[PDB]
Amino acid sequence: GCCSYPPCFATNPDC
Protein backbone atom coordinates (compact mmCIF):
# COMPACT_ATOMS: atom_id res chain seq x y z
CA GLY A 1 0.00 0.00 0.00
CA CYS A 2 3.04 2.27 -0.52
CA CYS A 3 1.32 3.98 -3.49
CA SER A 4 -2.26 5.07 -2.74
CA TYR A 5 -2.78 6.13 -6.37
CA PRO A 6 -3.97 3.62 -9.06
CA PRO A 7 -0.79 3.44 -11.29
CA CYS A 8 1.50 1.20 -9.22
CA PHE A 9 2.80 -2.24 -10.46
CA ALA A 10 2.61 -4.27 -7.21
CA THR A 11 1.72 -1.36 -4.92
CA ASN A 12 4.32 1.34 -5.70
CA PRO A 13 6.84 2.60 -8.26
CA ASP A 14 9.03 0.21 -6.16
CA CYS A 15 7.15 -2.24 -3.85
Instruction: Please spell the DSSP secondary structure of 1-15, one letter per residue.
Output: ----SS--SSSSTT-
In sign, the C-alpha dihedral spanning 6, 7, 13, 14 is positive
Residues 6 or more apart in contact with residue 5 via CB below 8 angstroms: none
Residues 6 or more apart in contact with residue 8 via CB below 8 angstroms: 2, 15
In sign, the C-alpha dihedral spanning 12, 1, 11, 6 is negative
